[PDB]
């Protein structure tokens, strides 16, 4: 996707408006010097009181900033003069378990957390293929981490046999988050 | 809502079965004296190798246990002789924010976590009424906890003016989790 | 941590001048002797402040820390700045389990809050578990790491010895918390 | 740390001959291990296999005591364990360290993943003159509850308070930016 923010010259998103999809060192060249309202459609962004991204800063998040003092957190902060999108570094651990081989059918997506019961999460189907984007996981045949263990690491598993399962049945999954070396 | 567990005399949910919606001190009456498989539709439950909920214990959660050794890892466990539902103590911090007054219209559900942007959560509407089921929250007019603050505590807020907002607009909420003292007493 | 909240209002900014310690709710700071609210210093909170008396108007949440100026809690430069205060009765529930080395809740001890512990050895606890105290939550203790071995359902109460939670030998190496339930009484 | 550490014994309850392992072992009987009686994990986690060359049933060994074969498998086998290898765990974190004095000196505070609305409640009542961001995207604030001047803290080193935009070396609350709607 593309970062999207729109600054308005007046309050309550009125008057002239300018759309920004990248970094802006000087805002007077957009037709809006003293911004009155800001609509953030895809961010986040960081704004600065001076040109060329200097001075006091303020972070914009997705939402509506209808007033001139909405995004500031200190009264002595001057008007918006420069703005740029933030390249957020946020890592997560994701594993996707599919009902049919070759990553088709119904799927369940797990992010970071352990799932002791697949049935409680609304997934009562089989598990024939697994895609691990990140993290180290262990799958189990039965709820509560019972039954045969399946170490699931970063990679693709086109078939249940590819991660050691005789039949395509997985009902619980936990994540290994600790490591006493390296 | 009642708990639901089904026990079978044979593995893979075959043979005679018995459904339990409450505790059973002796599985001898249910016709399934040595359960071969167990189906947990609503739990969790805890099983016991002896009657009257004694001996080694096994925790059953929602799902399918198709073998008589599936709910345990020890090989010394005896057959299932009694079961009872677990009265789980799991607390969550819940706040509901509605679009129209009197708790109507589009609603947004927040549990435990902070939300710095209502728009990122799929809620781009106004906030005219609030229902706080549990927890201590602070609502804000603008994303990133900016603007006027509104202390949202346990109870109902039928109008925006009831939680201190003449303007029905909330875009970020954080939960107060820490507290450096303990209020003793009763009321 | 104390038995009462604690906040201090200073007449001037940066915690200078006359100070006024508050240990409870105050509906009107002015009539109590506070000439001005120059700065606010929270040592046992949190608190909520209000622009007007009777806890009305704009609200300011004060947490433990330093609020050295008016612009630290409000963007409007009013002469009142802060007219009332009261301690917040926070509703923050946690699930606490404490496992002791010796019976009757003595010896080495390890406390777990909310989260699951798949390995006691990785958490620094390599000793036996003879007594257990469940403050809140529903827990399952296992005798081996990775939630393997004999199971012990640990619920709200006290366990003086291993036999009280059905353990033949005081050995526990992993505990997980039960967080879901599909039936309501 | 540095190297993994598993120790496998011939008899149960960690009795008999002991063969230490600091890496992968395709075949346990060739390293002098007759029978896998008990397993003690001092630095892991490890993954064991019922057959050689890391094939067959899998057993996850975490730090702790595994005194009998019942602890990792329910099927009695003559050879309960044939191969062992350390797991290369993929576990990402977001750490930021804030130091009292410039150039990363004095008292310090580390924050992992979670937001901190009050440094005083966290046990840190000092100034913040230098910041080291090893991972994640953070916004530091002058006052508790994410108030006052904001400072965007990104991956890198800030040796002085002015390096992250603070003419006054004061930080009392930090939150992490977790979401992004582009790229």
From Swiss-Prot, chain C:
Residues 90-94 are annotated as: Connecting peptide. Residues 5-44, 45-89, 95-136, 137-179 form the Beta/gamma crystallin 'Greek key' domain. GO terms for molecular function: identical protein binding; structural constituent of eye lens; structural molecule activity. SMART domains: XTALbg. One of its GO terms (biological process) is visual perception. It comes from the Eukaryota. InterPro entries: Beta/Gamma-Crystallin (IPR050252), Beta/gamma_crystallin (IPR001064), G_crystallin-like (IPR011024). Keywords: Acetylation, Cataract, Disease variant, Eye lens protein, Repeat, Sensory transduction, Vision. Pfam families: Crystall. Belongs to the beta/gamma-crystallin family. It is linked to Cataract 3, multiple types: An opacification of the crystalline lens of the eye that frequently results in visual impairment or blindness. Opacities vary in morphology, are often confined to a portion of the lens, and may be static or progressive. CTRCT3 includes congenital cerulean and sutural cataract with punctate and cerulean opacities, among others. Cerulean cataract is characterized by peripheral bluish and white opacifications organized in concentric layers with occasional central lesions arranged radially. Crystallins are the dominant structural components of the vertebrate eye lens. Has a two-domain beta-structure, folded into four very similar Greek key motifs. Homo/heterodimer, or complexes of higher-order. The structure of beta-crystallin oligomers seems to be stabilized through interactions between the N-terminal arms. This is Beta-crystallin B2.
């Amino acid at each position: 996707l593309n970062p999207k923010i729109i600054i308005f010259e007046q309050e309550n998103f009125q008057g002239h408006s300018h759309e920004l999809n990248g970094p802006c060192p000087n805002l007077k060249e957009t037709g809006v010097e003293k911004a009155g309202s800001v609509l953030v459609q895809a961010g986040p962004w960081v704004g600065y009181e001076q040109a060329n991204c200097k001075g006091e800063q303020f972070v914009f998040e997705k939402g509506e900033y209808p007033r001139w003092d909405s995004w500031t957190s200190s009264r002595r902060t001057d008007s918006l003069s420069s703005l740029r999108p933030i390249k957020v570094d946020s890592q997560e651990h994701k594993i996707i378990l599919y009902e049919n081989p070759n990553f088709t059918g119904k799927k369940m997506e797990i992010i970071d957390d352990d799932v002791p019961s697949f049935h409680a999460h609304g997934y009562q189907e089989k598990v024939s293929s697994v895609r691990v984007q990140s993290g180290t996981w262990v799958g189990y045949q039965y709820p509560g981490y019972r039954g045969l263990q399946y170490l699931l690491e970063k990679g693709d598993y086109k078939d249940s046999s590819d991660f050691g399962a005789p039949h395509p049945q997985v009902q619980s999954v936990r994540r290994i988050r600790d490591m006493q070396w390296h």
